[PDB]
Amino acid sequence: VFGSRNDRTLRRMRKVVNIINAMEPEMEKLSDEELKGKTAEFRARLEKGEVLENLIPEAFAVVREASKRVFGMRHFDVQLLGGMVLNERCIAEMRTGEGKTLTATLPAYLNALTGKGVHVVTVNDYLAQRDAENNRPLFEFLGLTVGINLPGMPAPAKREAYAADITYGTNNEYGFDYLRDNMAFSPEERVQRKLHYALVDEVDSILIDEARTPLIISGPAEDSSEMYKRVNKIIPHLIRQEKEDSETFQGEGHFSVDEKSRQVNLTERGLVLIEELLVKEGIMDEGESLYSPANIMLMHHVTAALRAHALFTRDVDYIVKDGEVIIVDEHTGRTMQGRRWSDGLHQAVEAKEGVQIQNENQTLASITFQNYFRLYEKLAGMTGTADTEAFEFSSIYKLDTVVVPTNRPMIRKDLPDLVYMTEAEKIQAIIEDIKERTAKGQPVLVGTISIEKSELVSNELTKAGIKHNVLNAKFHANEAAIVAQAGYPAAVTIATNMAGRGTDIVLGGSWQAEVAALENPTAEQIEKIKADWQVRHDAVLEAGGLHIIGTERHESRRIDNQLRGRSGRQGDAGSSRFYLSMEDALMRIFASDRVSGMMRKLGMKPGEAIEHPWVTKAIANAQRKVESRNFDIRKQLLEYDDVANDQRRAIYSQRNELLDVSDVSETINSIREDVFKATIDAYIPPQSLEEMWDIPGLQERLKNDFDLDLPIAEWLDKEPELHEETLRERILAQSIEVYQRKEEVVGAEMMRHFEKGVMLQTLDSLWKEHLAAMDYLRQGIHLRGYAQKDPKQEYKRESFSMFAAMLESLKYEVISTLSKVQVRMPEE
């Protein structure tokens, strides 16, 4: 892209808009089938040597033309600007009323021409299926295909929707689909296509709030994981006092009077008790430490058995009857038979006693939305008039913030904040502001964020004698009835914490809702009501438009601005008036209410409008400061997230390669020699002495993990010229020979499929571990981050070592399993 962002971008887009407007009269001379022909033409031109960004003038013109024949609505110039910006990797701010559907249709058609697939992200399935079928007669009219992806849709149908030019779906399913696709065994099992372009309807929520939302799939294999019972089996060999089993201890702990430390904690700062668990039996007995990133998984498993012994006492902390585990509450004497402590805690208990061990419930597959949308090349979306955290768009997703002009001039009179001392003053001032407008015939919308104030203002309004209708969310039918005339002259509507966007309240009321209340609305009736409605609309205009009143403001300006943007629909008339008291909790956001107390000496004067604009500016400053503090926190959290993100991306790339390719002999053989070398180097050091070689250890390992019986002691005994290198190669050669011999019995193509599957399976198996391991270290690093060292940097270091170790273990078991397989080999 070229041209100064924002400033120059605005006029740059205008240059194209002019061309589109000039070519419009020409498009009106083109037949319906010609518009369709242009769409196909662009497809050909794109492969010929045409730039997508250069097709905008013609493409947008076709869309504008087609829309006039399909919907009869011409895409406004302001919409052309926004739709054009949505072709890049930027976020466009759209005012309430401009027309999101009439804007998002432009970038969709343009990017759809590439045939890569336009991924439209919706907040819910309602809008997803709504716009999908609504815009269908438009896109399909030009030849493009519209596909809808609903959560839970079968793979066959998904493939049809994903193979379409434009795909409508929810962010939730979008992420899950990606997970299922990447966790496939065969490339034909895929459901996705390409992450070329993504257009999200509301970034305010999906990109901001849902940024740190991880799609955790808890899909266990069930069965019976009796493997855990073999771990806890080593505990009864110890005594709770010394040698591993000890409730905290730390030398003393407490007196001999039921010293069961049920506060968990756990420590073992002696480093002499843990020495009893390590070594012997098998696994974690080779010489590995339990306080290493390459053994964090077992660390969180062995401690589970410990915190299931003296931590959870039988019959008091929990009760198991007939295999049914029920938690016993000692606080109020309650029994929880439908609950179980996660983090593998319940599993340790079920593995301690004669209970059937389950398959737990942890992260089988997970991905964060932020780490998902960041994979898309062209990531664009629409945002509301909220701003605030909008600055984080460039830091979280690296998107540029662009504002789109309104269709009509916004005549929303924004008034300053009138801060009073007591709530009585604040409320009374509101009543007065409303009462004065009740005589002028101006509709008043009270945005109470607190239910306590909603009833308070309602009682006060009744006291003064002012008509009012409260939007009780418990009665949607009531709300719809009020909203229909919420813009009616002198109509006081009270809203208790309204969600974003909201219904498009038309000034004067809604004749549609009026004619819909009649049995048979004839042409005469409709025209009559429209005539009356017209007068009602003009009346509100002379009154001052829709008057918004805010009793209390919100910390995050995102919601604050959302309420302010309720008026002036598509550039209409309105007035915003906010109030505040020294009793409201909002005065605590200024670091300390003691500071805000300086405003108590402003005079106030209940009944006199002090009108001080600097007050609003002060509040707005603090409002953005609150989120600035949150931003620092979000950044700190994302710091750890990106670490797992890169590792995930890396391992997913390798898994994808092995997924797409059919043959994997190259990889298998290349890692085969490496695995053997590493295993040999562990018993036989390079360029050492004969008496420095552990022949028995290597032989046993070969006859254990590689299923290869080789008498190395006999080989070197008769062949002294074997030296070392030749000896290593001999073992490898013999392995390859027997390997091929096993292969011939199973089948060449079959073995290749087997190896491919085993690689993916082993990778996935370790991936499940790594997912939990990352978490174990994520929280455990808090006790590892000492002074004179950054806890994030050290974490990344340990995480890198963990990943490396995982890779080594991957190649190890992959080659081992491929050899461990007991194939029925006949006498050759």
């Binding site: 069965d223 855990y228 696994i283 998984m297 077992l298 398959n359 046993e700 599957g757 939990a772």
Partner: peptide, 28 residues
């Protein structure tokens, strides 16, 4: 004779718990 006894029968059951969540199986 020299009876070299060793605990080669190590118990990887503790590790199998991690892969237990997605324990797929083929022919063997």
């Amino acid at each position: 004779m020299m009876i070299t006894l060793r605990k080669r029968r190590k118990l990887p059951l503790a590790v199998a718990v991690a892969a237990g969540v997605m324990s797929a199986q083929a022919m063997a």
